Amino acid sequence: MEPGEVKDRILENISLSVKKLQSYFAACEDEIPAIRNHDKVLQRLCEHLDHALLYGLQDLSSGYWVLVVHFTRREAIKQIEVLQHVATNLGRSRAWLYLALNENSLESYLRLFQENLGLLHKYYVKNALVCSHDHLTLFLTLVSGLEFIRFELDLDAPYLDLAPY
Amino acid sequence: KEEMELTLVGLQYSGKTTFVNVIASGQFSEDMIPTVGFNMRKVTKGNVTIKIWDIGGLPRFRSMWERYCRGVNAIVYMIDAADREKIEASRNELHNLLDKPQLQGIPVLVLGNKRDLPNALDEKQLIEKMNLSAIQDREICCYSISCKEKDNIDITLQWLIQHS
Ligand SMILES: Nc1nc2c(ncn2[C@@H]2O[C@H](COP(=O)(O)OP(=O)(O)OP(=O)(O)O)[C@@H](O)[C@H]2O)c(=O)[nH]1
Ligand SMILES: [Mg+2]
C-alpha cells in the first residue's frame, strides 16, 4: 500500500512476465519463433511495462510519447506518427513500446531515461517509478531479458488508444 | 542553432563512446562500458547542435547500424588503428554497410583512432588496408586521430560541421 511497495509490485509483475515470455519463446516449435500481439504472454508483459511507464506521469493523457520522442530516431517517430489507426499520444506511447520490443531496444531507451533526469522530472512527478534510482536500475535489469527474443508486433493496433479510467 | 545528425559505427573498443565524451566535455577515460545497443547525445559546437547516434560495435549490434545510419547527415566509421588483428573485420563490416542501397550518397568519415599507440597505422596505410580507394560513389575522407592526446579532433569536427 505504501508507494514503495506499489512500485516493487509493478517490478515483480514485470519480472514474472519476462520469465513466462522467455519460457514461451524457448518452447515454441514454429520454424521461425516470434512473439505476436495475440500471445497472452505478450499482452501480460506489455500491460505491466505500460504500468511502469504510466505510473507518475504528470499528464496521463499525453502518455510517455512526449518524453520518448526526445530519445527516438526520426524515422521511427515518423513511422509512429503516420499509423492510420493510432490516433492519440497515449496510443502512440504504446505503439512506441511495441516498436521498442520489435527492435529489442528497451534497454537503450531506459539508459537514456537514467541519463536525462532533467527531462524525466519535466514529465513525471517525484513519486514516479522511473524517478527512483533504485527502481529504474532494476527496471533496466529486468528488460535486459528481452534482448534475444524475436518480437513481430503489429504497431497499428487500434486498442492502443484506450485510456485508463 | 543549426542542427545535424551523425551516426557513429565501428567495431567494439574502437573509441566511439570515448570520442563523444571528448567532444562533449573534453574528458578521456581509460575505463569504459561497452555500449549495449545505442547511446544518443547532443553536443553543440559553435552554432551547430549535433545529435550523435553512438551505436554499439559488438557483433550482435552491427545488424542495427544501417537502421541508425538511414537519413543522417554523415556516418563516422571508427577504427582502432593500433589493433591490426581487427582491421580485416573492420574492413569487411565497413564495405558491408556501404553496400546497403538505402545508405547511398551519405558522406563517410573514417577515423583511425588511437594514433598515440606505438604500432598505430597512419592515414596512408589505413586508406590502403581499408580499401577506401574502392569507394567512388560517395564522399569519403580518412583522418588519423587520438581521443587521448587530442590529435585531429578539431579537424574532425570541422569536417562534420561542413556536412551539417
Ligand atoms: N590509447 C588510446 N586509447 C583510447 C583512445 N580512444 C579510446 N581509447 C580507449 O579505448 C577503449 C574503448 O573505448 P569505447 O569508447 O568504450 O569504445 P566503443 O567504440 O564505444 O565500444 P563499443 O561501445 O563496444 O562499440 C577505452 O578503454 C578508451 O580508453 C585513444 O585515442 N588512445
Ligand atoms: Mg561505446
CATH assignment at residue B35: 3.40.50.300
Q: Could you tell me if residue A45 is inside a domain?
A: yes
The answer to whether B99 touches B30, Cβ cutoff 8 Å, is no
Cell reading at A129: 517509478
| Best residue for ligand 1 mutational test, from B9, B14, B17, B18 (most atoms within 8 Å of Cβ) | B18
Secondary structure class of B152 (helix, strand, coil)? coil
Q: Nine-digit cell at B12?
A: 567494439
Q: Residue A10 is placed in which grid cell?
A: 509493478
Exposed/middle/buried for residue B102 (C-beta within 10 Å: 0-12, 13-18, 19+): exposed
Reduced to 3 states (helix: H, G, I; strand: E, B; else coil), residue B44 is strand
Which of A7, A17, A51, A37 lies closest to A143, judged by CA?
A: A17
Determination method here? X-ray
Residue A165: inside a domain: no
**Number of residues that make up chain B:** 164
Q: Rounded distance, CA A138 to CA B143, Å?
A: 41
Residues 6+ apart with CB under 8 A from A58: A122, A123, A124, A125
Type of residue numbered A15: S
Strand partners, B6: B52, B74
Domain with A119, as residue range(s), is 3-155
- Domain extent for B82: 2-162
Residue A23: inside a domain = yes
In a domain, A163, yes or no: no
Q: How far apart are CA B148 and CA B26, in angstroms?
A: 10
Using CA atoms, how far apart are residues B37 and B61, in angstroms rounded to an integer? 6
Please name which ligand lies nearest the alpha carbon of B115: 1
Question: For the CA atoms of chain A, what is the radius of gyration?
Answer: 15
Question: What gap in Å lies between CA A140 and CA B33, rounded to an integer?
Answer: 15
A104 vs B contacts (CB less than 8 Å):
37
Number of domains in chain B: 1
Provide the 3-class DSSP secondary structure of residue B142.
strand
Residues B101/B9, Cβ–Cβ less than 8 Å: no
Closest residue in A to B72 (Cα–Cα):
A74
Q: What is the CATH number of the domain that holds A98?
A: 1.20.58.900
Residue B25 in contact with residue B90, Cβ under 8 Å?
no
**Which candidate, B114, B67, B54, B106, places its Cα nearest to that of B86?**
B114
Find residue B111's DSSP bridge partners: B78, B143
Rg over CA atoms, chain B: 14
Per the structure, how many domains does chain A have? 1
For residue A163, the distance in angstroms to the closest alpha carbon of chain B comes to 30
Q: Indicate if ligand 1 lies below 6 Å from the C-beta of B30.
A: yes
What stretches of A28-69 show up as alpha helix (H) in DSSP? 40-54, 65-68
The reply to whether residue B5 touches residue A74, judged by beta carbons under 8 angstroms, is: yes
Task: Map grid coordinates 538505402 to a residue.
Answer: B102
Residues 6+ apart with CB under 8 A from A57: A63, A64, A123, A124, A125, A128
From residue A147, alpha-carbon distances to A25, A33, A129, A140 in Å are 12, 15, 22, 11
Nearest alpha carbon to residue B76 among B3, B158, B156, B162 = B156
A162 occurs within a structural domain: no
Q: For residues B99 and B134, give the distance between their C-alpha atoms in angstroms, rounded to a whole number.
A: 12
Closest ligand 1 atom, CA of B29? 29
Query: CB–CB of B39 and A71 under 8 A?
Result: no
